[PDB]
Amino acid sequence: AAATSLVYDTCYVTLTERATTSFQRQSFPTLKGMGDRAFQVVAFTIQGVSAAPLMYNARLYNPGDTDSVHATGVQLMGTVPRTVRLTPRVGQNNWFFGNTEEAETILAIDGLVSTKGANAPSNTVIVTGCFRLAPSELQSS
Amino acid sequence: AAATSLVYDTCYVTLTERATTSFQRQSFPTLKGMGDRAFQVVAFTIQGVSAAPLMYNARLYNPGDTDSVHATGVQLMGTVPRTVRLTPRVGQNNWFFGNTEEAETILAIDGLVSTKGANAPSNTVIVTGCFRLAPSELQSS
Amino acid sequence: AAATSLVYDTCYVTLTERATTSFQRQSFPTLKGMGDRAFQVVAFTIQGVSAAPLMYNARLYNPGDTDSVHATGVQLMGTVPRTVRLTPRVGQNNWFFGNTEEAETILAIDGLVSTKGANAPSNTVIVTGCFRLAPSELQSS
Amino acid sequence: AAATSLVYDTCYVTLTERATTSFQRQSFPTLKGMGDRAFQVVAFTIQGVSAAPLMYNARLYNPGDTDSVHATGVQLMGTVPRTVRLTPRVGQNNWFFGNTEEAETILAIDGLVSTKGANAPSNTVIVTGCFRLAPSELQSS
Amino acid sequence: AAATSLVYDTCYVTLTERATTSFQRQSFPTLKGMGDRAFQVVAFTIQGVSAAPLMYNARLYNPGDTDSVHATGVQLMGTVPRTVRLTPRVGQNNWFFGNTEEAETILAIDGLVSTKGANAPSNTVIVTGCFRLAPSELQSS
Amino acid sequence: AAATSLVYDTCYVTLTERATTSFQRQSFPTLKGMGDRAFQVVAFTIQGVSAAPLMYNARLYNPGDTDSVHATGVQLMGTVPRTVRLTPRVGQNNWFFGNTEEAETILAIDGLVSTKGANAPSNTVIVTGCFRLAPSELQSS
Amino acid sequence: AAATSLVYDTCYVTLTERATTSFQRQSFPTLKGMGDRAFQVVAFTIQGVSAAPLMYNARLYNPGDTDSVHATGVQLMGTVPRTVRLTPRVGQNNWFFGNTEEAETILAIDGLVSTKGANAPSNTVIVTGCFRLAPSELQSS
Amino acid sequence: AAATSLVYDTCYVTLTERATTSFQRQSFPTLKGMGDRAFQVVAFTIQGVSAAPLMYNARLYNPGDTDSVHATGVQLMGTVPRTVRLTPRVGQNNWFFGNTEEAETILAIDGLVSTKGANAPSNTVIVTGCFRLAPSELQSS
């Protein structure tokens, strides 16, 4: 019997008006280089500052889905950091197997503007994931 | 943070002796036209009347499965409405992502006869689903 | 007996100085495409950010009224999201019948400026409605 | 001060496959001939027998609406009486003023079939309303 | 969030034998000049003195109704003030939107005589309304 | 005996650097058009946003005074709404008689700058008064 | 309503140094011949004896995954039976639908050696699965 | 030590007037294909619908008996499903060894008519068995 580990990884980014920013396995330091060991999304924390009015929407993906099974819903962005926590419930947190490709999408954050055609002001978003890890699937000699 | 909504949708149908009736996303009014927002099956209620002896079997599908992961098992049909409730347990209720195709199967109900080659008498079945809905995955301007 | 469903829908917008933004049935994704089934306003949540000083006033309409029966009263807008909740009491929440036209007004938000003739700075408003839904009024075959 | 009266009225009918049966003020004996005194729907009880499989859907109207604000949802009909009770909640029970026209619709019951083009078998439906009555609006001499 | 105000307004009148006296928005001082802000009837108090036998009947109207949804029922009038209180229950107190026309009817009081063709003796009636007020629907600059 | 009513009225404004903005009877919708009925200041709520550093000072006047008997003291203004409540104690809340002139001053708000000769940046202030109202002083026929 | 059955199935094997032994649906007697009825992994018990030092690693697969979502982690093997229990948590136990192919992988056990190129000594492993079974998806006549 | 499994299997049928329908090992999906592992009857549930008056009698057999050691006794059949549960007590539930032949009889249901020579109307019967299973009797390599 080998106990499950728990880790917090974190990348960040600047959002773009009519675009979606993808956070894949490679986006999270530890997950990117931990090797062949499965993992699961426990919770995600999203902090966000924008120089001017601006919205976003963080969406959690299940492994191999073409679209997100969970989301935070549009969030406003002020000139001050504001945090939102996304938590998957049953059926929104299937485990990603050990060999999940580096480019696999985990969390995607859409950028949105309320005035047609407008462009996103300066803005930053810090995304922190909380993941469980099953035992390493080691190689024999 | 945006709370999960809960909705009851309902279609119906006449079953056919050696056929399976599929209830897809489009079969449920609200789900059909709610747009890009994920959902999950909470419970299903099946009512059924048959003019003569006749059986059926409601089966719950997970998203994208070729076969059902849960079922009610064959049920008899009398000349009076009789209700059965199907409830998914963990692993039988994965969430369907927001962009799930309209033709995706959710619940399938097989029609059965106990005498070889016989045909199904007049019969109706009312199917009501209970679904959870994640936040809408809106578009930017 | 068929239980009432509860749903959260949400659109957003940029307000204009001496104009009123109308949120009609079509403005809410689920309501827009759920078909012929009545609904009622439970509560409305309004979040708002403005790049510079700016006011607004959300007003709830009863079905078919020429004017709003409830309102939040003018609200100030800062460079940071600030939420206000509008809740109808008895007589301010009559049900909208199933066939309510898509263009029917539910919530209207006026934009206001404190200096004569001034124009509204960049601003966004996220509006979330909480609605009850009566059973679907289905068609026969 | 004059206390509110409470009355139970009741008509019945045979439903038709792709038609809607309207129960108007005139359909209820007492309401039809009580004169100029307002009233309100408290509850409705619907009993139903059908010689063969058949569905129906009772829908409550508010005064002067073009469509129903409440409904029971489709109900199955067996060869034995089965009762359903419809109860309006706030916003679904506005009072009908004393001079409400005899032809005003209160409850409408749709008839439905699960097989395209089929016809409704023998069937009866007993509808009982429970209404509150405000004081009579009498005439002077 | 802006709290609801509560106000007591009051007009009076002499009743006429086979006539109905209408108390419209303009009849109540504050309501007449408060501007664009919705309101609701909480309770009405009616005091009445008559030099000789005489009856009356106060009736509450919902907004835009052609007839009253509530009433006190005929009341006798003595040579001494006698008060009656009319209180709307759910469905008899819908809110009047902010722009309700000044001539809109709220309470109507019928005058009645027990002897055919007789005329009403000297009489006065003091009517006091209790109303809730939603926030003012202000104009922008 | 006629109970005292309680009302919330509200106007707003943009402040000017070395000027005082007066809120008179006419500035409050209901008070402006309620007619001949006395009133008293219960409390005042002042919200304020400023695009840049800026101060203000709300001062309550007694009826007919040449200067304010109460004040909030200078308040700072940030890029986010900040509320302050002014409440009169005994001797600072004398009643204004029914015929108080429309131009009578109730609350005055001074605008202030910390750098000599500087000008006030964009700014808005929402002022809400809470007033008690004595019975209407009606006219005879 | 038909209750879920619970079954224990068990196969065994000799592990090979740099190879992975797959336990598919066919490997478990009952599952192999039970027909079209879905099932789920509850727990797995692995017993193991090795004539000389030797390691192994049991890994649980979700249905249709290319890699395992759970594992026991490398385990040592002595000259005496030693048991380890593998239990899936949420997201590691999705149900396998009724028509799951006989060759579908459920549990895979890797064989490992600590000295490069060495070969595995005599060894046996007994694997017992605990599975839940949904109702049979029967055929009509 | 290996725990006993518990399974629910279920077949169905149309009964014939003066005939006995046998449910053998092969009639139950799981039992038919589970291989060499003994089992025992825990309980049997029998549901039954008949288009017209008709009787039946379910009888439990011990392994290898020429006649049933337990029975439900004649049961009436209505136009509505009616369930009966048969439970063996000690001496009526001997275990069937692993190699029990597929054609071995477990439960037999006689069809009966109350009028001499009459024929059975349309009818269906759903039979569900509850069985305990001893460990599999596996083969060596």
Coordinates of N, CA and C in Angstrom, one line a residue, chain F residues 15 53-57 74-77 110-114:
Chain F
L15 N -19.2 66.6 -7.4 CA -18.7 67.7 -6.5 C -17.7 68.5 -7.3
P53 N -7.5 61.2 -5.9 CA -7.6 61.7 -4.6 C -8.6 62.9 -4.5
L54 N -9.5 62.9 -3.5 CA -10.4 64.0 -3.4 C -11.2 63.9 -2.1
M55 N -11.5 65.0 -1.4 CA -12.3 65.0 -0.2 C -13.6 65.6 -0.3
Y56 N -14.5 65.3 0.7 CA -15.8 65.9 0.8 C -16.2 66.0 2.2
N57 N -17.3 66.7 2.5 CA -17.8 66.8 3.9 C -19.3 67.1 3.8
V74 N -14.4 65.8 7.0 CA -13.8 65.5 5.7 C -13.7 64.0 5.5
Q75 N -14.0 63.5 4.3 CA -13.9 62.1 4.0 C -13.0 62.0 2.7
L76 N -12.2 60.9 2.7 CA -11.4 60.7 1.5 C -12.2 60.0 0.4
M77 N -11.8 60.1 -0.8 CA -12.5 59.5 -1.9 C -11.6 58.6 -2.8
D110 N -19.6 69.8 0.9 CA -18.5 70.6 0.4 C -17.5 69.7 -0.3
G111 N -16.9 70.3 -1.3 CA -15.9 69.5 -2.1 C -14.5 70.1 -1.6
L112 N -13.5 69.3 -1.4 CA -12.2 69.8 -1.0 C -11.0 69.2 -1.7
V113 N -10.0 69.9 -1.8 CA -8.7 69.5 -2.4 C -7.6 69.8 -1.5
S114 N -6.6 68.8 -1.4 CA -5.5 69.0 -0.5 C -4.3 69.8 -1.1

